[PDB]
Amino acid sequence: SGRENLYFQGHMAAPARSCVYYDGHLPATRVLLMYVRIGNTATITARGHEFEVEAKDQNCKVILTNGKQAPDWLAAEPY
């Protein structure tokens, strides 16, 4: 609880200018859907549901270009 100590610089999602869409509730159970270039749109079909996304920024939120919010299981991380 109370020990102000630093945390190691660890492997995190690095802004690699591509958003990689995964079906994953966690960054562990993630299933590789596709790689989208930052600044491009992509129809993500998962479970027979198409999510038209736009890889807005290299933080890689899953923001649908159709105006929707995606399910919690739909993740994106920069490659």
Q: Residue 63 gets which letter from DSSP?
A: B
Q: How many CB atoms lie within 10 A of CB 21?
A: 25
| 3-class DSSP state of 66 | coil
DSSP codes of every residue in 11-42: ------SEEEEEE-SSSSS-EEEEEEETT-EE
Counted domains in the chain: 1
Tokens of 65: 């270009």
Identify whether the C-beta of residue 33 lies closer than 8 Å to the C-beta of residue 24.
Answer: no
Identify whether the C-beta of residue 69 lies closer than 8 Å to the C-beta of residue 76.
Answer: no
* Range(s) of the domain holding residue 53: 1-79
Report angle CA 79, 60, 50 to the nearest 5 degrees.
95
Enumerate the β-bridge partners of residue 32: 22
Identify whether the C-beta of residue 72 lies closer than 8 Å to the C-beta of residue 25.
Answer: yes
Identify whether the C-beta of residue 41 lies closer than 8 Å to the C-beta of residue 53.
Answer: yes
**Solved with:** NMR
Q: Is 46 left (phi over 0), alpha (psi -120 to 50) or beta?
A: beta
Indicate the length of the chain as a whole number: 79
